C-alpha cells in the first residue's frame, strides 16, 4: 500500500507527526533525502530501506517551530532570578558559600 507522505499537505503541522524521539521512517518523512557514497555512475541510496539514515540520531522531533512551541508551554514552570543579584560582584557578597555538585546522564538499566 502507498506511503502516507503523499497525503501530507505542504502546510501541515510538523510537530504532530513526530511528537517525540522516533526512528527514521521513510514512509513518514516527506523528504527525498538520500544518504550514501554513490557507486561508479551511481547515486546515493534512496531512503526506503536505507539503514544509514535509520542509524542517525535524528532531530526531526526537535525543530525550531517545535522547540519554540515547547518552550512557550514550559515557561509556566519557571521562577525569576532575584533582580538584586545583577552580576557576580553582588553574588559573592550576599551569598558567599558556593556548593558545587555533579550529576551524570548515562544510558543503561542502572
Amino acid at each position: 500500500l502507498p506511503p502516507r507522505t503523499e497525503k501530507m499537505a505542504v502546510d501541515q503541522d510538523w510537530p504532530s507527526v513526530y511528537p517525540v524521539a522516533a526512528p527514521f521512517k521513510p514512509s513518514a518523512v516527506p523528504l527525498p533525502v538520500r544518504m550514501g557514497y554513490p557507486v561508479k555512475k551511481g547515486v546515493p541510496m534512496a531512503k526506503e530501506g536505507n539503514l544509514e539514515l535509520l542509524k542517525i540520531p535524528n532531530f526531526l522531533h526537535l525543530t525550531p517551530v517545535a522547540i519554540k512551541k515547547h518552550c512557550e508551554a514550559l515557561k509556566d514552570f519557571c521562577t525569576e532570578w532575584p533582580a538584586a543579584l545583577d552580576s557576580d560582584e553582588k553574588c559573592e557578597k550576599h551569598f558567599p558559600i558556593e556548593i558545587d555538585s555533579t550529576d551524570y546522564v548515562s544510558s543503561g538499566p542502572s
Partner: peptide, 30 residues
Amino acid sequence: EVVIPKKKTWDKVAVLQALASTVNRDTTAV
C-alpha cells in the same frame, strides 16, 4: 535586597503533560 522567590513544585509528570498538550493529533496517520 535579595528576595528569594518561592519554589514551584509540580507532579512527577507535569513537563511531559505540558509537552503533550502542545502537540495535536495527527490526522494523516493511524
